[PDB]
Design a protein around this nucleic acid. Structure first.
Ligand SMILES: [Mg+2]
Ligand SMILES: [Mg+2]
Ligand SMILES: [Mg+2]
Ligand SMILES: [Mg+2]
Ligand SMILES: [Mg+2]
Ligand SMILES: [Mg+2]
Ligand SMILES: [Mg+2]
Ligand SMILES: [Mg+2]
Ligand SMILES: [Mg+2]
Ligand SMILES: [Mg+2]
Ligand SMILES: [Mg+2]
Ligand SMILES: [Mg+2]
Ligand SMILES: [Mg+2]
Ligand SMILES: [Mg+2]
Ligand SMILES: [Mg+2]
Ligand SMILES: [Mg+2]
Ligand SMILES: [Mg+2]
Ligand SMILES: [Mg+2]
Ligand SMILES: [Mg+2]
Ligand SMILES: [Mg+2]
Ligand SMILES: [Mg+2]
Ligand SMILES: [Mg+2]
Ligand SMILES: [Mg+2]
Ligand SMILES: [Mg+2]
Ligand SMILES: [Mg+2]
Ligand SMILES: [Mg+2]
Ligand SMILES: [Mg+2]
Ligand SMILES: [Mg+2]
Ligand SMILES: [Mg+2]
Ligand SMILES: [Mg+2]
Ligand SMILES: [Mg+2]
Ligand SMILES: [Mg+2]
Ligand SMILES: [Mg+2]
Ligand SMILES: [Mg+2]
Ligand SMILES: [Mg+2]
Ligand SMILES: [Mg+2]
Ligand SMILES: [Mg+2]
Ligand SMILES: [Mg+2]
Ligand SMILES: [Mg+2]
Ligand SMILES: [Mg+2]
Ligand SMILES: [Mg+2]
Ligand SMILES: [Mg+2]
Ligand SMILES: [Mg+2]
Ligand SMILES: [Mg+2]
Ligand SMILES: [Mg+2]
Ligand SMILES: [Mg+2]
Ligand SMILES: [Mg+2]
Ligand SMILES: [Mg+2]
Ligand SMILES: [Mg+2]
Ligand SMILES: [Mg+2]
Ligand SMILES: [Mg+2]
Ligand SMILES: [Mg+2]
Ligand SMILES: [Mg+2]
Ligand SMILES: [Mg+2]
Ligand SMILES: [Mg+2]
Ligand SMILES: [Mg+2]
Ligand SMILES: [Mg+2]
Ligand SMILES: [Mg+2]
Ligand SMILES: [Mg+2]
Ligand SMILES: [Mg+2]
Ligand SMILES: [Mg+2]
Ligand SMILES: [Mg+2]
Ligand SMILES: [Mg+2]
Ligand SMILES: [Mg+2]
Ligand SMILES: [Mg+2]
Ligand SMILES: [Mg+2]
Ligand SMILES: [Mg+2]
Ligand SMILES: [Mg+2]
Ligand SMILES: [Mg+2]
Ligand SMILES: [Mg+2]
Ligand SMILES: [Mg+2]
Ligand SMILES: [Mg+2]
Ligand SMILES: [Mg+2]
Ligand SMILES: [Mg+2]
Ligand SMILES: [Mg+2]
Ligand SMILES: [Mg+2]
Ligand SMILES: [Mg+2]
Ligand SMILES: [Mg+2]
Ligand SMILES: [Mg+2]
Ligand SMILES: [Mg+2]
Ligand SMILES: [Mg+2]
Ligand SMILES: [Mg+2]
Ligand SMILES: [Mg+2]
Ligand SMILES: [Mg+2]
Ligand SMILES: [Mg+2]
Ligand SMILES: [Mg+2]
Ligand SMILES: [Mg+2]
Ligand SMILES: [Mg+2]
Ligand SMILES: [Mg+2]
Ligand SMILES: [Mg+2]
Ligand SMILES: [Mg+2]
Ligand SMILES: [Mg+2]
Ligand SMILES: [Mg+2]
Ligand SMILES: [Mg+2]
Ligand SMILES: [Mg+2]
Ligand SMILES: [Mg+2]
Ligand SMILES: [Mg+2]
Ligand SMILES: [Mg+2]
Ligand SMILES: [Mg+2]
Ligand SMILES: [Mg+2]
Ligand SMILES: [Mg+2]
Ligand SMILES: [Mg+2]
Ligand SMILES: [Mg+2]
Ligand SMILES: [Mg+2]
Ligand SMILES: [Mg+2]
Ligand SMILES: [Mg+2]
Ligand SMILES: [Mg+2]
Ligand SMILES: [Mg+2]
Ligand SMILES: [Mg+2]
Ligand SMILES: [Mg+2]
Ligand SMILES: [Mg+2]
Ligand SMILES: [Mg+2]
Ligand SMILES: [Mg+2]
Ligand SMILES: [Mg+2]
Ligand SMILES: [Mg+2]
Ligand SMILES: [Mg+2]
Ligand SMILES: [Mg+2]
Ligand SMILES: [Mg+2]
Ligand SMILES: [Mg+2]
Ligand SMILES: [Mg+2]
Ligand SMILES: [Mg+2]
Ligand SMILES: [Mg+2]
Ligand SMILES: [Mg+2]
Ligand SMILES: [Mg+2]
Ligand SMILES: [Mg+2]
Ligand SMILES: [Mg+2]
Ligand SMILES: [Mg+2]
Ligand SMILES: [Mg+2]
Ligand SMILES: [Mg+2]
Ligand SMILES: [Mg+2]
Ligand SMILES: [Mg+2]
Ligand SMILES: [Mg+2]
Ligand SMILES: [Mg+2]
Ligand SMILES: [Mg+2]
Ligand SMILES: [Mg+2]
Ligand SMILES: [Mg+2]
Ligand SMILES: [Mg+2]
Ligand SMILES: [Mg+2]
Ligand SMILES: [Mg+2]
Ligand SMILES: [Mg+2]
Ligand SMILES: [Mg+2]
Ligand SMILES: [Mg+2]
Ligand SMILES: [Mg+2]
Ligand SMILES: [Mg+2]
Ligand SMILES: [Mg+2]
Ligand SMILES: [Mg+2]
Ligand SMILES: [Mg+2]
Ligand SMILES: [Mg+2]
Ligand SMILES: [Mg+2]
Ligand SMILES: [Mg+2]
Ligand SMILES: [Mg+2]
Ligand SMILES: [Mg+2]
Ligand SMILES: [Mg+2]
Ligand SMILES: [Mg+2]
Ligand SMILES: [Mg+2]
Ligand SMILES: [Mg+2]
Ligand SMILES: [Mg+2]
Ligand SMILES: [Mg+2]
Ligand SMILES: [Mg+2]
Ligand SMILES: [Mg+2]
Ligand SMILES: [Mg+2]
Ligand SMILES: [Mg+2]
Ligand SMILES: [Mg+2]
Ligand SMILES: [Mg+2]
Ligand SMILES: [Mg+2]
Ligand SMILES: [Mg+2]
Ligand SMILES: [Mg+2]
Ligand SMILES: [Mg+2]
Ligand SMILES: [Mg+2]
Ligand SMILES: [Mg+2]
Ligand SMILES: [Mg+2]
Ligand SMILES: [Mg+2]
Ligand SMILES: [Mg+2]
Ligand SMILES: [Mg+2]
Ligand SMILES: [Mg+2]
Ligand SMILES: [Mg+2]
Ligand SMILES: [Mg+2]
Ligand SMILES: [Mg+2]
Ligand SMILES: [Mg+2]
Ligand SMILES: [Mg+2]
Ligand SMILES: [Mg+2]
Ligand SMILES: [Mg+2]
Ligand SMILES: [Mg+2]
Ligand SMILES: [Mg+2]
Ligand SMILES: [Mg+2]
Ligand SMILES: [Mg+2]
Ligand SMILES: [Mg+2]
Ligand SMILES: [Mg+2]
Ligand SMILES: [Mg+2]
Ligand SMILES: [Mg+2]
Ligand SMILES: [Mg+2]
Ligand SMILES: [Mg+2]
Ligand SMILES: [Mg+2]
Ligand SMILES: [Mg+2]
Ligand SMILES: [Mg+2]
Ligand SMILES: [Mg+2]
Ligand SMILES: [Mg+2]
Ligand SMILES: [Mg+2]
Ligand SMILES: [Mg+2]
Ligand SMILES: [Mg+2]
Ligand SMILES: [Mg+2]
Ligand SMILES: [Mg+2]
Ligand SMILES: [Mg+2]
Ligand SMILES: [Mg+2]
Ligand SMILES: [Mg+2]
Ligand SMILES: [Mg+2]
Ligand SMILES: [Mg+2]
Ligand SMILES: [Mg+2]
Ligand SMILES: [Mg+2]
Ligand SMILES: [Mg+2]
Ligand SMILES: [Mg+2]
Ligand SMILES: [Mg+2]
Ligand SMILES: [Mg+2]
Ligand SMILES: [Zn+2]
Lengths: 107, 97, 95, 70
RNA sequence: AAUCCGCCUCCCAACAAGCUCUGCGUGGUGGGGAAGCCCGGGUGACAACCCCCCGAAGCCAGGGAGCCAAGAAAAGCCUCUAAGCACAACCUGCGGGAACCCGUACCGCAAACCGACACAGGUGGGCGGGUGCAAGAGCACUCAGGCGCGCGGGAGAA
RNA sequence: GAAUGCCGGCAUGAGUAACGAUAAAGAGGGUGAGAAUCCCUCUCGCCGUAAGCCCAAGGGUUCCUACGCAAUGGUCGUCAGCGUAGGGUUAGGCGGGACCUAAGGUGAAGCCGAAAGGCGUAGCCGAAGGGCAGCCGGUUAAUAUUCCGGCCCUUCCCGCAG
RNA sequence: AGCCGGUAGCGGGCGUGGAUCCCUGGAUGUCCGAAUGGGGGAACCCGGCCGGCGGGAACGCCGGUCACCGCGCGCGCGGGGGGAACCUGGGGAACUGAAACAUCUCAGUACCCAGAGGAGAGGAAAGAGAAAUCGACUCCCUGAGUAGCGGCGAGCGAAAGGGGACCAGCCUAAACCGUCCGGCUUGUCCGGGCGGGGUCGUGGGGCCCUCGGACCGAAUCCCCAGCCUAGCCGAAGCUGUUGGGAAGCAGCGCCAGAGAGGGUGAAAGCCCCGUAGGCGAAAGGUGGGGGGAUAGGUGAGGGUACCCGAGUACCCCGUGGUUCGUGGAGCCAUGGGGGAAUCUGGGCGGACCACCGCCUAAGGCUAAGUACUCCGGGUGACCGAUAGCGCACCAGUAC
C-alpha cells in the first residue's frame, strides 16, 4: 500500500554501515520507490558534466548518492543516541515515532 | 411431423434392428443381427379444426389426443372469448390443460 | 455541458491559415464530430462575429513510432469560417 | 490548486443555484479555451493552470449534478 | 372514387403548323494568349484572335429502317380523384432566409495495386496529335509529355 | 554421435553464379569528408493507341518543405517511395448518403423443422442501372468543378401577388 | 511525508489546514456491442415525438423517449447476451479393438445444440428383494472384476447388504363447502376463477352422528455475532579487525509465545521488511452460526362407500435404459393401435399361475454431504530462460 520508512526528511541519522559508517547527518531526501535516503555530506560521487548552459566550463560536480534506507538510523533528539524506532499512541490518539533507548519523541 | 400441441408427444429416435435366423424357441440356432441403424418414430399428428366463439381454431395434435381437443372446447363454455383473435383463443384453450 | 468552447479547440497555426486572415477566413481545430451548422454558432458565440460560410475537412493523424512502438497521432478536424464583410476575429489577428 | 482553495471552491459552489452553476461553468470553459490558445503559441509558462481549470469545471459539474439528482 | 386513362361514336386538325424539350451557333460579360530573348517568372503583346478544307464511333435522341433470338424495375415527373379541407391547400411569378453528413493529399499498366522482392507476369473505363504507307487504334518516324529500365570499367579466346 | 531427428550458431561451395529486359550513352559546371550513380547545362539515344494524360478499384501519407545517410536501395549515394520533424486534402451544384428500385438478401402475415435452424407474398435493404442543380479562368511548395473571380443554377422555409 | 502512473527532461504545480497512495459508496461515463427508434459493410449513417439552444421556420446541436417476444390486468413485470472448467437435458461419430470384418468395441466418448447455477442433477417409495428385513436422495469406501452379459469372441460389467459423509422434509389434484363471473338448454344446471377443506399405505381423506380442547415451528422475513473487501502494534548489539563493503573473524553482551523467510556492499535472531503473539471497519458484500417474528403444523370411535392425479394403467406392436446383444426377458421408459377401474382399486417380488408378502403410478418443490477452478491465498525431495504457460520481456503480439 505504501513503502514503510522508519526515517524521514529531515531528521538526523547515523550511517551505520558502508564506507561512510559512523557519519551522522541530516536526511536531505527520501526516495520510497528506491527504498533509499539522501544524507547530507555522505556518499559523495564525482559526476561528469558537459560544457553547457547549466555547467559552463564543464568538468565535474559532486552528487550525494542515495543510501539504502536500512543502512541508516535515526538519532534521538532527547538522549542523542542512535535508536530503533518504536510507535506510541498519544491521547488524541495520533501515533508517533519514539526512541527505543529512552522514550523521547523523534516526530 | 413435429409436436403434439396437447400432449407434447414429439419425434423419438428408435433403432431399426434387422435380424436373421431361426429363434431358439423354434429349435433354431438363434437370431443374428445383420444391421442396426437409427430412425425416427413420429407422433401421429393430424389437423383438428374447431369453431370456438365464432372463430375457427386449428390444432396440430397426435391422433391419440384428438378427443382432448373437444374436451377443451367444452370447458371453454365457461370463458369469455367473444371478440378475441384466434391466436388469443388458442392460448386460452391450452391454458385449461 | 456542451458549450461553444467545447467545439472550438485551438487556432490552426500555419502559413496557409494565416494567409486567410486578410479575407476574414479563420481556421480552427474543431471537435471531430462537430457539424458546420454548430461550428457557425460556436464561433459567433465565442468571438462576436457573423459567420456567413463554413468549410470543414478531416485531418487524419500521422502514424509515428518511438523505437519499437508504432502508433498514430489522433485524428483532427479543421474548419474555415468566413466572417461577415468588415468583421474581424481579433484574437487570431494575433498574429 | 491548493487544498484550501478547493474546499473554498466547493463551499461556494454548493451555495449557487443550478442556473448560476451553468453560467460559471460556461465562463470557466471560456477561460480554458483562452489557456489553450495561449499554450498553443508558447505563451503559457504556467501550464499547471490548464489542469486546475479542467478540474474546477469538473467539480462545478459535480455540484450541479448533486443539486439536480434530488 | 375519378372530369383522368381504356373502349365506342361524331366533329375538326394532320408527314403542316401549334405547344413543348434538347443540341448547336450567336450572345451583355469574363478569360486565355506562342516562338524567341532576358533571371517557374518577366518580355513578346494594346498580341492577333479571321478565311477555307477534312470531320467523328460523340451531340440533337426517347431519330429512322430491317430483323428474330422479341429486348428490367421503381422513384422523380404529369394527370385523376378519396378521406379530409375548402379564412385551408396546391400552381405560377417574385422576394428574403436556409442548405447537413462522408470522400477529396499522393501512386494508379505501376518502384506506392495482385504476385514473399523497387519481380520482363496480372490489372476495368476515357483521351491518345502529325506525315507517309489503299484503309486503320496496323507499321516507320515524330509532337506534347515521359524515359535511357539503381553496378560499372575494359578486353575482343573457346 | 547418428533418428534425411529438433532449436540455434557457424562453416563449404567462393571472392565463384549473379546484380532482373541489348532503349545507350558522353562531356562541362556545381555541391560535398566522399560523386560513373545527386543538382544544372549541352550533345546522344528510347517510347509516343505510350513507356504520355485523365478516371475507377486497390494501397493508406507513399504528397510538399527542411534536416539527415546506420539500415532499406541488388553497386554508389551528397539522392530517394528510406530516418526525424513541420506543413498539406476546403463542395447546396463532383461522387455517395438524408431518393428509386435489379439480381440477391432480409422479412409483418404465414408455413416447416429434435435443438441450432430452413422457407416466406407484402415491406425493407441492396448499384457502376434510374433520378438529380456548375461552366471557364486565376491562385499554393503542396487542394481546387471544393478557395478566388466572372457568369449561371437547384431544393427547403417564410412572405407578397396572381 | 511525501507527491503530479510506467518516465527521466523541458515548463510549471501540490502536500501535517493531512497531499500522492490503499478500501468502500457515489457522480461522470463519446461510439459499437444482446444492442433494442430505423438502417448498416460493428464502432457509421438516417428518423418520429416532447422539451431546450441559435436570428431560427427551413438547418443543426443538447436532454428525454420510441425494438421484439412472454406473462399479467395501453399500462406493469419478466426475457434476450456473456462466463475457464464443472452440471443437466436434446442429438451424436469415427479411427481404434476384435491381430481381417458386419453383430460387438471404442462410447452415449469427441463434438453440435438448449438450459441451469454457484453448483447442477437426484430426492421423501406404485423403492428394494428374502432379511419374518430395510426405510428419500446425493457422494466416498467396500461388496466386486463378484452376479451376470458376450460373433459366450475381443471384451463389457451391475445391485442388494456392510462401513462412512450429510441429514429434512413439504405443497398440491379430487370428495365436500363458499363466493364471484357467463353460457343457454333455466336450474338441485354446466363451465371458468378465487377462498376454505384435504395430502395418505399401521391405507388416507370427504360427508353424517358421537364423545374430548396448549405445545410444535420453518427451507420465508428482521436483528446480531462471525467472515470478506484497506490496514495496525510487534522483543533484543555494540566495539575491534581484514576488506570497496562485514552480516566473515575476534571481544563482551542481549532477545526469544518471535532462530519461518526475504533484504541490506560478503555469510545478520538483536540494521531493514517481517515472523510468534495480538489488534482493526464509518461504507459495501456475506452471514449455513445465535436470537426474534411470521407462515404452517394437531383427537378417538362409529356409520356412509362420496374422493384418492386418463387417452393414464393394462395388453399388443416397434425401440431405448439396465449386467441383460431375443434370451425363459421380468423391471423402468414410450413412437403406433386397442383401452379400464377408485381400495373388494391398482403396480411389484425376472415368462406364467397359485400362495405369501412389498408398495401406492399417471401433479410439483426441497437445503446439506458431491463436481469444477476464470479469481484470491498457502505450500512444494516442482521448472529455472531450448526449462516452466504459447508469452519472465508491451504476446495471442510480430509474422
Ligand atoms: Mg505504517
Ligand atoms: Mg557494518
Ligand atoms: Mg566507527
Ligand atoms: Mg489519523
Ligand atoms: Mg439418442
Ligand atoms: Mg424396424
Ligand atoms: Mg427364442
Ligand atoms: Mg426347450
Ligand atoms: Mg444374437
Ligand atoms: Mg399432417
Ligand atoms: Mg380432422
Ligand atoms: Mg398411443
Ligand atoms: Mg386411440
Ligand atoms: Mg457530460
Ligand atoms: Mg502559403
Ligand atoms: Mg449549435
Ligand atoms: Mg467536404
Ligand atoms: Mg467531411
Ligand atoms: Mg496517440
Ligand atoms: Mg481534487
Ligand atoms: Mg473568460
Ligand atoms: Mg370504379
Ligand atoms: Mg365524359
Ligand atoms: Mg451551347
Ligand atoms: Mg443560347
Ligand atoms: Mg481580352
Ligand atoms: Mg502570356
Ligand atoms: Mg519559360
Ligand atoms: Mg516565355
Ligand atoms: Mg512594347
Ligand atoms: Mg461539312
Ligand atoms: Mg463503330
Ligand atoms: Mg427508335
Ligand atoms: Mg422465333
Ligand atoms: Mg419490382
Ligand atoms: Mg417504394
Ligand atoms: Mg367529405
Ligand atoms: Mg393547375
Ligand atoms: Mg431563393
Ligand atoms: Mg442529418
Ligand atoms: Mg480511395
Ligand atoms: Mg482533391
Ligand atoms: Mg488529385
Ligand atoms: Mg495527381
Ligand atoms: Mg511511379
Ligand atoms: Mg498523376
Ligand atoms: Mg500489361
Ligand atoms: Mg490504363
Ligand atoms: Mg505511370
Ligand atoms: Mg513496393
Ligand atoms: Mg509489388
Ligand atoms: Mg529496378
Ligand atoms: Mg513490374
Ligand atoms: Mg488489359
Ligand atoms: Mg491529344
Ligand atoms: Mg509516295
Ligand atoms: Mg493518313
Ligand atoms: Mg504499308
Ligand atoms: Mg496500309
Ligand atoms: Mg496514325
Ligand atoms: Mg499488327
Ligand atoms: Mg505501334
Ligand atoms: Mg511530328
Ligand atoms: Mg523532349
Ligand atoms: Mg540502360
Ligand atoms: Mg540495370
Ligand atoms: Mg578478354
Ligand atoms: Mg549411437
Ligand atoms: Mg543431410
Ligand atoms: Mg539435411
Ligand atoms: Mg547424402
Ligand atoms: Mg537435423
Ligand atoms: Mg544432433
Ligand atoms: Mg533442424
Ligand atoms: Mg542448422
Ligand atoms: Mg560461407
Ligand atoms: Mg551458408
Ligand atoms: Mg576472380
Ligand atoms: Mg569481380
Ligand atoms: Mg567453381
Ligand atoms: Mg566463371
Ligand atoms: Mg537472380
Ligand atoms: Mg559474371
Ligand atoms: Mg538476371
Ligand atoms: Mg540490365
Ligand atoms: Mg560531372
Ligand atoms: Mg565536377
Ligand atoms: Mg556518385
Ligand atoms: Mg560518393
Ligand atoms: Mg546507367
Ligand atoms: Mg541532373
Ligand atoms: Mg501517333
Ligand atoms: Mg500495401
Ligand atoms: Mg512513413
Ligand atoms: Mg499533392
Ligand atoms: Mg512524406
Ligand atoms: Mg535535402
Ligand atoms: Mg543509407
Ligand atoms: Mg551509405
Ligand atoms: Mg554509409
Ligand atoms: Mg541517426
Ligand atoms: Mg541496401
Ligand atoms: Mg548500398
Ligand atoms: Mg533488388
Ligand atoms: Mg551531407
Ligand atoms: Mg526510395
Ligand atoms: Mg517525392
Ligand atoms: Mg520522407
Ligand atoms: Mg513547411
Ligand atoms: Mg461552390
Ligand atoms: Mg447526393
Ligand atoms: Mg433531411
Ligand atoms: Mg436509402
Ligand atoms: Mg427501397
Ligand atoms: Mg413469426
Ligand atoms: Mg430467411
Ligand atoms: Mg423475397
Ligand atoms: Mg425507404
Ligand atoms: Mg436504397
Ligand atoms: Mg446510384
Ligand atoms: Mg447514377
Ligand atoms: Mg450530382
Ligand atoms: Mg454551367
Ligand atoms: Mg498535385
Ligand atoms: Mg494545396
Ligand atoms: Mg465559386
Ligand atoms: Mg393568394
Ligand atoms: Mg507522464
Ligand atoms: Mg521538475
Ligand atoms: Mg483522515
Ligand atoms: Mg469507485
Ligand atoms: Mg448501442
Ligand atoms: Mg441500433
Ligand atoms: Mg436491425
Ligand atoms: Mg423541436
Ligand atoms: Mg447567428
Ligand atoms: Mg429552433
Ligand atoms: Mg437528441
Ligand atoms: Mg436464447
Ligand atoms: Mg443463443
Ligand atoms: Mg444466462
Ligand atoms: Mg444425454
Ligand atoms: Mg452422424
Ligand atoms: Mg466401425
Ligand atoms: Mg482405444
Ligand atoms: Mg488410442
Ligand atoms: Mg486389444
Ligand atoms: Mg480390427
Ligand atoms: Mg488388428
Ligand atoms: Mg482392414
Ligand atoms: Mg455403447
Ligand atoms: Mg450429451
Ligand atoms: Mg470433453
Ligand atoms: Mg433441447
Ligand atoms: Mg446460456
Ligand atoms: Mg457448495
Ligand atoms: Mg434443484
Ligand atoms: Mg427436481
Ligand atoms: Mg410423496
Ligand atoms: Mg468377496
Ligand atoms: Mg457400454
Ligand atoms: Mg450404507
Ligand atoms: Mg466430510
Ligand atoms: Mg434421513
Ligand atoms: Mg349467473
Ligand atoms: Mg366445474
Ligand atoms: Mg359451480
Ligand atoms: Mg366454483
Ligand atoms: Mg376410510
Ligand atoms: Mg417450506
Ligand atoms: Mg513493525
Ligand atoms: Mg524488530
Ligand atoms: Mg579499512
Ligand atoms: Mg561491525
Ligand atoms: Mg561473534
Ligand atoms: Mg518459526
Ligand atoms: Mg534470512
Ligand atoms: Mg535462510
Ligand atoms: Mg554464517
Ligand atoms: Mg548460506
Ligand atoms: Mg537476516
Ligand atoms: Mg498469526
Ligand atoms: Mg500478524
Ligand atoms: Mg389429520
Ligand atoms: Mg375418525
Ligand atoms: Mg366410492
Ligand atoms: Mg395415486
Ligand atoms: Mg392429466
Ligand atoms: Mg414394449
Ligand atoms: Mg438394449
Ligand atoms: Mg429391450
Ligand atoms: Mg441368453
Ligand atoms: Mg430384459
Ligand atoms: Mg388391494
Ligand atoms: Mg384388482
Ligand atoms: Mg407397472
Ligand atoms: Mg407389467
Ligand atoms: Mg408382475
Ligand atoms: Mg418388488
Ligand atoms: Mg418370482
Ligand atoms: Mg394378494
Ligand atoms: Mg415394493
Ligand atoms: Mg441445511
Ligand atoms: Mg443446491
Ligand atoms: Mg449440495
Ligand atoms: Mg475444491
Ligand atoms: Mg493460484
Ligand atoms: Mg532455484
Ligand atoms: Mg532465452
Ligand atoms: Mg519459453
Ligand atoms: Mg543462460
Ligand atoms: Mg502468464
Ligand atoms: Mg511482441
Ligand atoms: Zn532517546
Amino acid at each position: 500500500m505504501r513503502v514503510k520508512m522508519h526515517v524521514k526528511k529531515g531528521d538526523t541519522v547515523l550511517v551505520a554501515s558502508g564506507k561512510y559508517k559512523g557519519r551522522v547527518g541530516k536526511v536531505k531526501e527520501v526516495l520510497p520507490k528506491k527504498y533509499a535516503v539522501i544524507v547530507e555530506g555522505v556518499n559523495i560521487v564525482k559526476k561528469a558534466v558537459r560544457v553547457s548552459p547549466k555547467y559552463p566550463q564543464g568538468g565535474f560536480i559532486e552528487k550525494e548518492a542515495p543510501l539504502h534506507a536500512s543502512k541508516v538510523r535515526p538519532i534521538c533528539p532527547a538522549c542523542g543516541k542512535p535508536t530503533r524506532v518504536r510507535k506510541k499512541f498519544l491521547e488524541n490518539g495520533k501515533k508517533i515515532r519514539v526512541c527505543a533507548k529512552c522514550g523521547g519523541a523523534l516526530d | 411431423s413435429k409436436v403434439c400441441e396437447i400432449s407434447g408427444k414429439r419425434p423419438i429416435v428408435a433403432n431399426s434392428i434387422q435380424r436373421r435366423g431361426k429363434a431358439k424357441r423354434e429349435g433354431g440356432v438363434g437370431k443374428k443381427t445383420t444391421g442396426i441403424s437409427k430412425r425416427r418414430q413420429y407422433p401421429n399428428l393430424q389437423k383438428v379444426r374447431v369453431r370456438v366463439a365464432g372463430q375457427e381454431i386449428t390444432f396440430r395434435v397426435a391422433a391419440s389426443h384428438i378427443p382432448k381437443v373437444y374436451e377443451l372446447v367444452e370447458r371453454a363454455k365457461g370463458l369469455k372469448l367473444e371478440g378475441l383473435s384466434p391466436k388469443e383463443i388458442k392460448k386460452e384453450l391450452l391454458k385449461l390443460l | 455541458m456542451k458549450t461553444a468552447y467545447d467545439v472550438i479547440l485551438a487556432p490552426v497555426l500555419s502559413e496557409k491559415a494565416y494567409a486567410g486572415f486578410a479575407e476574414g477566413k479563420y481556421t480552427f481545430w474543431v471537435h471531430p464530430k462537430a457539424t458546420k451548422t454548430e461550428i457557425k454558432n460556436a464561433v459567433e458565440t465565442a468571438f462576436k462575429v457573423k459567420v456567413v460560410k463554413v468549410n470543414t475537412l478531416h485531418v487524419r493523424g500521422k502514424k509515428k513510432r518511438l523505437g519499437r512502438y508504432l502508433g498514430k497521432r489522433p485524428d483532427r478536424k479543421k474548419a474555415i469560417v468566413q466572417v461577415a464583410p468588415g468583421q474581424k476575429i481579433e484574437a487570431l489577428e494575433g498574429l | 490548486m491548493k487544498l484550501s482553495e478547493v474546499r473554498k471552491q466547493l463551499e461556494e459552489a454548493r451555495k449557487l443555484s443550478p442556473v448560476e452553476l451553468e453560467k460559471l461553468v460556461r465562463e470557466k470553459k471560456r477561460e480554458l479555451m483562452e489557456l489553450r490558445f495561449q499554450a498553443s503559441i508558447g505563451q503559457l509558462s504556467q501550464n499547471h493552470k490548464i489542469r486546475d481549470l479542467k478540474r474546477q469545471i469538473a467539480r462545478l459539474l459535480t455540484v450541479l449534478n448533486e443539486k439536480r439528482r434530488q
